Amino acid sequence: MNVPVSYNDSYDTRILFWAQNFSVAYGEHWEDLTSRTFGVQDLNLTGSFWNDTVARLVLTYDSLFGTMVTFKFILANSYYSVSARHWFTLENLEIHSNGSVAYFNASQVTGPSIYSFHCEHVSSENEDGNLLVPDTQPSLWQMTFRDFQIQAFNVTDKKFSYASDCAGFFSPGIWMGLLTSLFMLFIFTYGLHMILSLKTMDRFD
Amino acid sequence: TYNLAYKYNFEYPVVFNLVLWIMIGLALTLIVTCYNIWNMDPGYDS
Amino acid sequence: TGLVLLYSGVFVAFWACLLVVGICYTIFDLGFRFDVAWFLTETSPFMWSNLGIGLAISLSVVGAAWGIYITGSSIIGGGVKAPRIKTKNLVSIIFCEAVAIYGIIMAIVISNMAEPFSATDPKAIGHRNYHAGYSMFGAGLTVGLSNLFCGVCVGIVGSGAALADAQNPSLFVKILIVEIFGSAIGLFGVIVAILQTSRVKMGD
Amino acid sequence: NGPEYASFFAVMGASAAMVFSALGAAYGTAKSGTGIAAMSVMRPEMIMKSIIPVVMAGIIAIYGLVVAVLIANSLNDGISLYRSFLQLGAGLSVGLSGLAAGFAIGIVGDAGVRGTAQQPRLFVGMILILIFAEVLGLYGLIVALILSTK
Amino acid sequence: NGPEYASFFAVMGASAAMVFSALGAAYGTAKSGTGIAAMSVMRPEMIMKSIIPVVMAGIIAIYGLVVAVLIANSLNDGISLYRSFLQLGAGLSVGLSGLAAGFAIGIVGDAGVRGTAQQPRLFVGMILILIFAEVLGLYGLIVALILSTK
Amino acid sequence: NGPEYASFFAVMGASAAMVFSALGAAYGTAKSGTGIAAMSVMRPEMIMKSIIPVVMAGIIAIYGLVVAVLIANSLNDGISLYRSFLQLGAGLSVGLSGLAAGFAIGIVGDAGVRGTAQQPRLFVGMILILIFAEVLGLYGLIVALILSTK
Amino acid sequence: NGPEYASFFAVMGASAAMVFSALGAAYGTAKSGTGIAAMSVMRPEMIMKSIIPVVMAGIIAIYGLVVAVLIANSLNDGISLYRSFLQLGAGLSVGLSGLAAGFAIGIVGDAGVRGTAQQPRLFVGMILILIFAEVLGLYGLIVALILSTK
Amino acid sequence: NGPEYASFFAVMGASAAMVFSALGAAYGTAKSGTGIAAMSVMRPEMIMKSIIPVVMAGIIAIYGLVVAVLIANSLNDGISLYRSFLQLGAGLSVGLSGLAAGFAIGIVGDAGVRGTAQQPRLFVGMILILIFAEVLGLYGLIVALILSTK
Amino acid sequence: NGPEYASFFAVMGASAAMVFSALGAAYGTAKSGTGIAAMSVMRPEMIMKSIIPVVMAGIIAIYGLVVAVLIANSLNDGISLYRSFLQLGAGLSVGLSGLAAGFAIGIVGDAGVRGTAQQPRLFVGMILILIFAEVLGLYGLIVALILSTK
Ligand SMILES: CCCCCCCC/C=C\CCCCCCCC(=O)O
Ligand SMILES: *[C@@H]1O[C@H](CO)[C@@H](O)[C@H](O)[C@H]1NC(C)=O
Ligand SMILES: *[C@@H]1O[C@H](CO)[C@@H](O)[C@H](O)[C@H]1NC(C)=O
Ligand SMILES: *[C@@H]1O[C@H](CO)[C@@H](O)[C@H](O)[C@H]1NC(C)=O
Ligand SMILES: *[C@@H]1O[C@H](CO)[C@@H](O)[C@H](O)[C@H]1NC(C)=O
Ligand SMILES: *[C@@H]1O[C@H](CO)[C@@H](O)[C@H](O)[C@H]1NC(C)=O
């Protein structure tokens, strides 16, 4: 299987995307839209916009929960002053059912533009760490990525560049619990060091 | 469409510190003990 | 030194490996992975605040208890031959009891300004609210460690004034001037502690 | 304006200007005031004249307090990252140099009042060294004001 | 222009130029200051001649004060990353070499004034070694200046 | 041109060439300087003959000075990462070898001056050992030169 | 060519080959240097006879110098990562072996020359033990050379 | 073939086999070398016979030498990650076992020659214990070879 | 098959089985070897009967050698991560428990041969304690065996 790519009329490619599983859920039923995407090799992508600062991907499937339902990956590419770089960001996502719009937010899917984001689970159904949150919490549309890699605005040689993972040696919660524990371990080894030196007398009178 | 990324698992913050703070917590116990026994002040005259 | 060789070994091996981990983030390209912004913003403004409220009272009574046994061992030590010390020289104990008072007064001041909110996003939790986290942290450090250091200060001079009073009773009034300058460092911390949190307001 | 995390370093600059200068003022008064109560048994005449090494360490505290009021009042919500590093580098310049001026006053002021109790000719020399020990903190003051006020 | 956190290294240059010179000059004043009090009990004539280790250690503090002011007046929001490492490298250069010169002046200043109490012929040699320990701060000054003008 | 973080390591080469050589020269001056005062109580004639080991440690300081200026004149905005690494290794090679050479000078300078105070025949042998202690910094100098020329 | 970060490890091979060997050559010259001065008061005839641990410690210094020049001459911009990792391993194999061999010469050079003041027959045995301490640096060469020719 | 950073682990085995065995061979030479000089002042006849612990410590050095060349002969760019981990595990298992064997030779070699100055019967007993301490370095060799052949 | 970095933990099991075990055997040879030289000055008749703790400590290295060979025989490229972790815990449980056993034979072998010279009745009791001292390495064997069969 290969990626859905969007090549430009000018002699350079543009934004490309990959997953293993791609499942979208509506209400209770789970639909595996991964053979129609990567192995099918033909897709209806209406508007693959590019302006060198804002780009989109529309993926439409025509055979889903009832009707023709499209997914919209929305990326952006800004210049951040503090970091003096170009950082791409998956802005939100959109699913379009009967008229209605799903609006899944995806922060922590950001990257520094030259490289590519890559995550393991970009799933919905919030537990703690899921990158996709809806705008309304009792939402019906849910989606699941068992793999993930998107590059946008800086694609070269029709393939991905280095990865900017969601891997995270310390994500914030372990990095709060470590800063709490290793602070009060300085208190405990201080209280132990005073106790380890209260030595008794040698003789009595 | 090559240059697919390396697939780090999603529990990478957990597994990294579950190894690290155990192993340097176990090695710190191992050096403290091994020190205490390396010299132990015997009564060696007899 | 046997137990100090542990802390001297941990402090070396920790940094040493920070250095090798520091010249391997820059040298590849991976300085974008460092993100002191993601450290200061993502974690909590409750962690910085409630640590500083805890460090305000606790680190002040650490130096308050530290100041007692330095001179309280000197009271009972010099008081065996000269028992006239015990009533006159308890003011040195109160001068390291005021530094716990400055702690607990500032502790209930800093605890009243903490208020829960609902937002969870670093943009939804505004810069009025993250500054509320850091200011309660820094106020706890400047009233916690300052009352600690002046707690040792009035205790050390209080121990010396307890021992000169055993030799000559007319000396303790003159040496008591030094403990006033030592106790002024405690009030200097409480001034900065209420200035860092004068304009602050936590909540949403 | 500035980012959300920007206000962190200015608070640390206001703290470390006061915390480390408190440690200097504590050592400068404890280590020297140890020598005051010690010499007072054999010579109670200089018991009011030798209180001046513990007040040279007292000015080390008020060096740290002035820059603390400067930073804690210039601090506001949404300061730039450039302004906060200036106030962080201000407080480290005054507190950790006042820590040096606190150690230099305490070691000299303890030794000076022992030699003054043994020979009173040293008193005109002791206050000269305490001048040189205190201006270490004074140089830390004028670099903190030239950094925070930019 | 450059990134926003570029000014962090520059104010770390202005800070570390001051404190590491101050921590050195504190060691020069304190360690030699104990040498003044130990010798003056027996030889009260050599107290005004013997203060030259605490004065030559004071030149280390003004070596740091010059570079700390020169860096702080060269600061600007949005300085480039290349300009910022120059002032950071100049701050550690005058500081840690002034810190090393602060140790060397304090050691030979302490042992020197104990020797001049036992023999006045050492007073011509003591300033010779104290100069050689003082130029180490001067060598750090001229390379901190060659980094700051760039 | 090179990356933006490249010039950090080159100015770290300029700093570490100075502050580590100055730390070495400070140890050679201080550890031998106490030996001069311990000799001078009995043999004041060999005072000027004994300024040589603090002079031999002084050449270690200017060994790091010439390469620090050599790195600082070769600095530029946006140098290559290959060039900046060459000056970083040039800085550590002269400073840490100068720190070792300054450590070697101060040890034999301490015992050799104390040893020649009891017997003047050691003085020709002592200054021979100090030659071997100096060339350790000279070997580190010439590799710092050929690393800075590339 | 290679990656941009490639030159870092080969240059750290050039610096560690010098400063670790110089650290060994310092400890070989300093620990044996204090042994000469404590010996020479009783037996002043064996001065030039007893410089041979100091000279053989200096051979450890030129041991690091040869490998540092050979590594610094193979340095080029954009070399492969395999080539630089060889010269990093070539640097540690001569430096940390020269630090070990330099530690070996210093200890027996201290004990050996103190014994020759009491008995002259040790001198023909002490030079034999210093040879076995010398080949440890020589074994560091032939691994460092065979790592650099590849 | 393997990755670009694969060669880093194998050259670490080439260095650590020589570095750690040199530290063992140094401690076998240095710690036993002090025992020769303390023995020699009373018994000058047992000097050529007393060098037998410093020769066996030299055999520890060539145990690390043969595997360092054997690993460096097996070095190549584009080696697999499996081949490099064996040579790293081979290098640690002979150097750190040679450091252990050189520790044991240094301890009993020192105490053995201090004991044989008072009794010549100990010389056949001391050489028996040195053989058992020698095979510790030899046992590290046969695991280093069985890891490097595959 | 397994991942590319899988073989590192297994060869770490092959090296830690030899490094810690030879280090354990080193301490058992060194500490008891000092006890032999202190014993034989007074009692030369029992040195054949007294080198038994040197021999009992030597099996600790042989216990580590067996697991070092057994792990290196199961090594192939593409081992599973489960099979690689089993050999890592095989080497740690026979190396570090051998280091525990070498501590016991080292101390009891030291003090036991001190009392064996002054009283020959201890020889029945001394070797009885050395039985319980050696089985710590033997218990580490059969857990290293039962981890390696899987
Ligand atoms: C996963 C947790 C791993 C870390 C466990 C920490 C527990 C270690 C407990 C302390 C063991 C220290 C033994 C030292 C003995 C001291 C000798 C003595 O008191 O005489
Ligand atoms: C995800 O896709 C895989 C096919 O690659 C399939 O086997 C699996 O069942 C799917 N999971 C879900 C939850 O749909
Ligand atoms: C592709 O999808 C869009 C949905 O907006 C639809 O209008 C269009 O007709 C589709 N094209 C094809 C060829 O199916
Ligand atoms: C590029 O397209 C975006 C899409 O909305 C638009 O906002 C922007 O102004 C365009 N820029 C240019 C230069 O045309
Ligand atoms: C869209 O409408 C049709 C007809 O009402 C229905 O069958 C289908 O389920 C709807 N799709 C979704 C996703 O609700
Ligand atoms: C979520 O997405 C919506 C889409 O319009 C946006 O308005 C909102 O700011 C996002 N919120 C977060 C927390 O990302």
Swiss-Prot record, chain A:
TM helices/strands, residue ranges: 168-188
Sugar-modified residues: 8, 21, 44, 51, 98, 105, 154
Protein localization: Endoplasmic reticulum membrane; Endoplasmic reticulum-Golgi intermediate compartment membrane; Cytoplasmic vesicle, Secretory vesicle, Synaptic vesicle membrane; Cytoplasmic vesicle, Clathrin-coated vesicle membrane
Post-translational modification: N-glycosylated.
Disulfide bonds: 119-166
Family: Belongs to the vacuolar ATPase subunit S1 family.
Subunit-level organization: Accessory component of the multisubunit proton-transporting vacuolar (V)-ATPase protein pump. Interacts (via N-terminus) with ATP6AP2 (via N-terminus). Interacts with RNASEK. Interacts with TMEM106B (via C-terminus).
Role description: Accessory subunit of the proton-transporting vacuolar (V)-ATPase protein pump, which is required for luminal acidification of secretory vesicles. Guides the V-type ATPase into specialized subcellular compartments, such as neuroendocrine regulated secretory vesicles or the ruffled border of the osteoclast, thereby regulating its activity. Involved in membrane trafficking and Ca(2+)-dependent membrane fusion. May play a role in the assembly of the V-type ATPase complex.
Full protein name: V-type proton ATPase subunit S1
Record organism: Bos taurus
From Swiss-Prot, chain B:
Disulfide bonding pattern of the chain: none
Transmembrane segments: 12-32
Domain of life: Eukaryota
Protein name: Renin receptor cytoplasmic fragment
UniProtKB/Swiss-Prot annotation, chain C:
Ion transport listed as a keyword: yes
Protein's membrane topology: Multi-pass membrane protein
Name of the coding gene: ATP6V0B
A GO BP entry: proton transmembrane transport
Residues exposed to the Lumenal side: 1-2, 72-89, 158-174
GO CC annotations on file: clathrin-coated vesicle membrane; endosome; membrane; vacuolar proton-transporting V-type ATPase, V0 domain
Compartments (UniProt record): Cytoplasmic vesicle, Clathrin-coated vesicle membrane
Protein name, entry field: V-type proton ATPase 21 kDa proteolipid subunit c''
Function, as annotated: Proton-conducting pore forming subunit of the V0 complex of vacuolar(H+)-ATPase (V-ATPase), a multisubunit enzyme composed of a peripheral complex (V1) that hydrolyzes ATP and a membrane integral complex (V0) that translocates protons. V-ATPase is responsible for acidifying and maintaining the pH of intracellular compartments and in some cell types, is targeted to the plasma membrane, where it is responsible for acidifying the extracellular environment.
Site-annotated residues for Essential for proton translocation: 97
Family: Belongs to the V-ATPase proteolipid subunit family.
Membrane-spanning ranges: 3-23, 51-71, 90-110, 137-157, 175-195
MF term (GO), any: proton-transporting ATPase activity, rotational mechanism
Tissue specificity comment: Expressed in brain (at protein level).
Ion transport keyword on record: yes
Keywords tagged on the record: Cytoplasmic vesicle, Hydrogen ion transport, Ion transport, Membrane, Transmembrane, Transmembrane helix, Transport
A Pfam family per the record: ATP-synt_C
Organism, scientific name: Bos taurus (Bovine)
Primary localization: membrane
Swiss-Prot record, chains D, E, F, G, H, I:
This protein's record includes keyword Secreted: no
Signal peptide start and end residues: none
Keyword terms: Cytoplasmic vesicle, Hydrogen ion transport, Ion transport, Membrane, Synapse, Transmembrane, Transmembrane helix, Transport, Ubl conjugation
Gene Ontology MF annotations: proton-transporting ATPase activity, rotational mechanism
Membrane topology label: Multi-pass membrane protein
Cytoplasmic topological intervals: 29-50, 110-126
UniProt site positions, description: Essential for proton translocation: 134
Lumenal side: 72-87, 148-150
Bilayer-crossing regions: 6-28, 51-71, 88-109, 127-147
Family: Belongs to the V-ATPase proteolipid subunit family.
Name of the protein: V-type proton ATPase 16 kDa proteolipid subunit c
Protein species of origin: Bos taurus (Bovine)
